Design a protein around this nucleic acid. Structure first.
Length: 124
DNA sequence: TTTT
């Protein structure tokens, strides 16, 4: 079983690109990390930061969770994020999404020993 | 699957 934080890594992290490449980039990656298998995920955002620095967001701004929990954390900084939004046409099987690239703050939920991201919560 |  994939750990919650490994899951996070797979689902939210593309450190080997500073930003989006094509507009196909969401389609390439959503599918690359298997978010298009039974799921057709509605949206997914990808931080183009090193890991080391994204678990750094755990010790930063302690903000509420969109969903009402106290263990979320705002990035003191701006991070480049690509966001992939399901386009009407995307039909699971063969899913499609709009690649939007941004520098923004991201809020992730943390837990465990060690404290790390398990949940990508929001961006601002 | 409303993205822990």
């Amino acid at each position: 079983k994939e750990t919650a934080a490994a899951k996070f890594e797979r689902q939210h992290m593309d450190s080997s690109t500073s930003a989006a490449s094509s507009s196909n980039y969401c389609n390439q990656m959503m599918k690359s990390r298997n978010l298009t298998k039974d799921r057709c995920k509605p949206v997914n955002t990808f931080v183009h930061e090193s890991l080391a620095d994204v678990q750094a967001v755990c010790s930063q701004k302690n903000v509420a969770c969109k969903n009402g929990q106290t263990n979320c954390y705002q990035s003191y900084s701006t991070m480049s994020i690509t966001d992939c939004r399901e386009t009407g046409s995307s039909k699971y099987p063969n899913c499609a999404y709009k690649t939007t690239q941004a520098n923004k703050h991201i809020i992730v939920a943390c837990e465990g020993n060690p404290y790390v991201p398990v949940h990508f919560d929001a961006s601002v």
